[PDB]
Subunit: 145 residues, 4 copies
């Protein structure tokens, strides 16, 4: 199955990227993400780097693009209904584009995986919408004053 | 050289696509496009189809994606400073994405070409911004009532 | 689930493309494809075009790229284990690249779908390998004399 | 302008990738590359990493994909005719695909840049063909014994 969620953020793309570009800095989504621990070697832009979030999501960075402003990762472990016992080949894909007419930012987040069920679809929609909502709340049409 | 312009349109992506999806229907950008004539065989979604706009832009459809909502074309002839005597390998790339949180539409338009100069850069920025501005004006935050 | 199969064909990419580029001409894979009937409007390069193969595979063209030499389609109906009762969102993706050093052709064919099982994986591997094998047999290192 | 060169290598894709996957290890192309020095922070898979080759090519890693087996970089400095005084926005794109039928590897290398001339086209074709030729020579149809 797969999910796709997107929002427009009232801040220039360079600023939004500067904030989210580090695979080991998730401080920008404090609602859902309570802890983000580096695991394995490699820094925040090093493909192969890993992280553990909330003590239960284990992610590996599988692709990074400075030029396209994209971060892609596998979710290697997670809580039900996205545990490794119920899904496989989970790939997350977070990507920015400029909205040039008013110098804002389009943010898209895709997820896809294999599974015998669609049980995880609602759950990841909820997760991604929360993460994106934090990102938007940080860059408001008035927070840009 | 290349150009990139984008806007957010206050209408659902299915509606925006329905309006722009036909390579031979350019009625949605009346400010700059005064006439759009079919040239050669193939309909509005047929790769290889061609069109003449304003009696001076000759375009060929070189790629079309219903699934990705993308139209790509070569500009084979055009007025200075985008005539075939001054540039080559012009490719235009028009593409939609949904903004899911509020059910709006992100629209991006890219152009790239080869040239001894950048003289065409300002000119195409002006063209694309006008075309996109028509698209936005048609789908206003209030025109969605 | 998904499948991916590829081969190298001893013929220039322009020749291979010329042979496979028509969504309604499948005469190049006579082993598995016994009949290919046009369904609905639109010609062989018209996105939206449909075809029925062997009286049981119903395909729709969902993307076409002359510039990238790619054909993408949904399989809307098929025999078990790829019937619409057992899988959904089947997308096939057939794409050519030149092998420039000796002027040959790389051919890749991808398939992906959603399903409660992987039962269709072996089956589509078998189908794609047969189709590609026909393509190769037609363009041999000696058939290029 | 741009260049595109490709070859088929008689070795499995995992082996070819293992050999070329490190932005700071260029030992696989000894014909043209005599020295490869790390510059700046970040390791061989860290986007932002830089290198100096032959004391004259300064490259920065701008994208890396483990999942797609791709390395992309900007050439920030180089000898004429690819010096920063004569070209700009040089991007190199090195990418592997499996040839599944016989378990070999397709290798493609693209380059693109902006320039008032095409003088660099022949020159980069020559460079890329040499680099690829080293890669092939290392993995021969008999070196796989």
């Amino acid at each position: 199955p797969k999910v796709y969620n997107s929002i427009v953020v009232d801040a220039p793309v360079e600023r939004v990227w500067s904030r989210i570009r580090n695979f080991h800095d998730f401080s920008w989504a404090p609602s859902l993400i309570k802890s983000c621990k580096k695991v394995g070697g490699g820094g925040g832009y090093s493909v192969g780097a890993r992280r553990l979030l909330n003590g239960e999501f284990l992610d590996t960075l599988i692709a990074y693009s400075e030029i396209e402003r994209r971060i892609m990762y596998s979710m290697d472990e997670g809580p039900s209904p996205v545990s490794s016992g119920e899904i496989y080949n989970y790939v997350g894909n977070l990507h920015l584009l400029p909205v040039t007419i008013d110098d804002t930012t389009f943010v898209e987040w895709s997820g896809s995986w294999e599974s015998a069920s669609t049980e995880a679809v609602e759950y990841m929609n909820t997760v991604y919408r929360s993460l994106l909502a934090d990102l938007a709340a940080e860059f408001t049409s008035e927070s840009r004053r």
